[PDB]
Design a protein around this ligand. Structure first.
Ligand SMILES: Nc1nc2[nH]cc(Cc3ccc(C(=O)N[C@H](CCC(=O)O)C(=O)O)cc3)c2c(=O)[nH]1
Ligand SMILES: Nc1nc2[nH]cc(Cc3ccc(C(=O)N[C@H](CCC(=O)O)C(=O)O)cc3)c2c(=O)[nH]1
Ligand SMILES: O=c1ccn([C@H]2C[C@H](O)[C@@H](COP(=O)(O)O)O2)c(=O)[nH]1
Ligand SMILES: O=c1ccn([C@H]2C[C@H](O)[C@@H](COP(=O)(O)O)O2)c(=O)[nH]1
Lengths: 285, 285
């Protein structure tokens, strides 16, 4: 099922159109793609290249905790957001009053406190805003046939206060035959760098919510808007494209957890992940 | 026998020729030297300057483990390879898709998996390649008169993939009268920085292999190729030369260990190491 991501890479290289972007780099773009990754007895952690699974696990716990402080995640070993929370990148977009790591109201804030008035990254928002994450878990428990199980991060009101507007803007859940499925709408997909990271992130999120609600993981539908391949990624991706995929690993939950907040990093174990060598690709800031 | 190391320092300062180097810091070099350090009831840990014995002990266990991950050694307190595993140094040698601290197929990989195809620093290579380290131990036990007990780390095939090609490239063992001796051919010797470290390193390795095979440590012959003294080490070494050596310490193994992989850092104790104050010397890499 990894061939779907590879088939999207090969289709952008062969049929994608050249298109400029905000960064000083260049892209080959295709608008509108959809792939289905099965979560049943396998976890879609890519094997054609080693994916930062510790980054995937620590960033999601950072989202669930509602933290918007980049130093909070960077103190765990995952420095993927320090570029968007640095003084050089923040001061270029008019954000001159931030302390250290103030991305603004981003994925963590919108998941737990949607609509609340964002002060800074250290302020308390308990009881403020809409808790989309906990409301989604409550709806799955009480009314699984509901078609409104949605957690949205795209907030036009808080949009100008974010260092980078949300890429995974909207995700919806779906229950049938005790199988929890998840579809993510990604408005902008860095096919070389972020997309493998984002697929594993929301696949893990489905496993956590399926563990709490007592359901089995079903499918993860990855819907893309602007799916692009940066020009400085063509050679590293052509090397990844020649690699033969290996079977997906498995994700094991080591203890029964009742609440979404009680998940710790030690509760997860990836079993049987044998990927090809890492392929470091430059980020476009 | 420490007067031999001092005699090699004094000979390079008095008869060495000026010669440029890869780091561009300049050296005084002499090609072809040999010293014999007795391992009988004494350990060659230099006393004219404090040698990082924790680095010696942790790096050798890191070599025996076959690890080529610099972060694995740096997480133990030994940052001697972090300079060669940094992002800045990796991108200078064309390695732009490697992970931070992937030294490539270096001493650890060639000792345990010679000839195997190096993927990256997290891949499993169990059963792949030639296990030179276990093969020499097997030969010493069964055929001590063998003249081919050699462990080679210089691999021209894997050479362009190394952050730094092996300096202690080839070493040979030798058994007579139940005495295990070891000769090391070091192609490039930092007389100020690495040579004292390497003398203690392979002396420790000989003690470990002698403990397994039931032999007594004999001699350690330190054969050098390019023995050089960096220009920014002349004054620090001229101060070390005026210091009088103290008796070598002793190395005690606290428990009987059967296999070479079962050695832990807590199993070794240096008794009676009274060195002179440290002399910090800048690294050229
Ligand atoms: N042009 C661009 N800008 C971005 N800003 C923030 C992100 C999200 C992001 C940023 C960094 C990483 C990252 O460094 N990922 C790799 C593993 C990702 C993988 O294997 O897919 C790592 O940590 O080594 C991942 C996602 C991101 C992205 O994907 N592309
Ligand atoms: N020019 C140069 N480049 C190198 N790249 C890798 C090494 C191996 C190495 C690296 C660092 C040290 C080191 O820093 N050693 C000393 C301990 C020895 C001592 O104190 O005498 C320390 O930790 O300060 C030793 C060997 C090394 C070396 O010796 N010299
Ligand atoms: O989870 C994420 C976060 C970021 N990006 C990439 C997409 C873009 O290349 C870049 C953001 O720039 P815009 O699309 O906002 O201009 O980050 C992803 O692919 N996934
Ligand atoms: O165990 C080691 C590792 C490195 N070096 C030093 C020797 C050189 O001064 C420097 C770099 O090696 P060259 O590739 O320039 O030979 O590292 C040693 O002396 N011993």
């Amino acid at each position: 099922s990894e061939l779907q991501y590879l088939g999207q890479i090969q289709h952008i290289l062969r049929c994608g159109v050249r298109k400029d972007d905000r960064t000083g780099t260049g892209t080959l773009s295709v608008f509108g793609m959809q792939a289905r990754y099965s979560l049943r007895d396998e976890f879609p952690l890519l094997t054609t290249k080693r994916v930062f699974w510790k980054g995937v696990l620590e960033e999601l716990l950072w989202f669930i905790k509602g933290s918007t402080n980049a130093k909070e995640l960077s103190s765990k070993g995952v420095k993927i957001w320090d570029a968007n929370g640095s003084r050089d990148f923040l001061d270029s977009l008019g954000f001159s009053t931030r302390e250290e790591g103030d991305l603004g109201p981003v994925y963590g804030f919108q998941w737990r406190h949607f609509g609340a008035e964002y002060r800074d990254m250290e302020s308390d928002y308990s009881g403020q805003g809409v808790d989309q994450l906990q409301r989604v878990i409550d709806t799955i428990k009480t009314n699984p046939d509901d078609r409104r199980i949605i957690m949205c991060a795209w907030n036009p009101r808080d949009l100008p206060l974010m260092a980078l507007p949300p890429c995974h803007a909207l995700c919806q859940f779906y229950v049938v035959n005790s199988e929890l499925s998840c579809q993510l709408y990604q408005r902008s997909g860095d096919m070389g760098l972020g997309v493998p990271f984002n697929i594993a992130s929301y696949a893990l999120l489905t496993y956590m919510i399926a563990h709490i609600t007592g359901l089995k993981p079903g499918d993860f539908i990855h819907t893309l808007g602007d799916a692009h391949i940066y020009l400085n990624h063509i050679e590293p991706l052509k090397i990844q494209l020649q690699r033969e995929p290996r079977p997906f690993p498995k994700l094991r939950i080591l203890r029964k957890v009742e609440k979404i907040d009680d998940f710790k990093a030690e509760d997860f174990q990836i079993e049987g992940y044998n990927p090809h060598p890492t392929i470091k690709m430059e980020m476009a800031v």
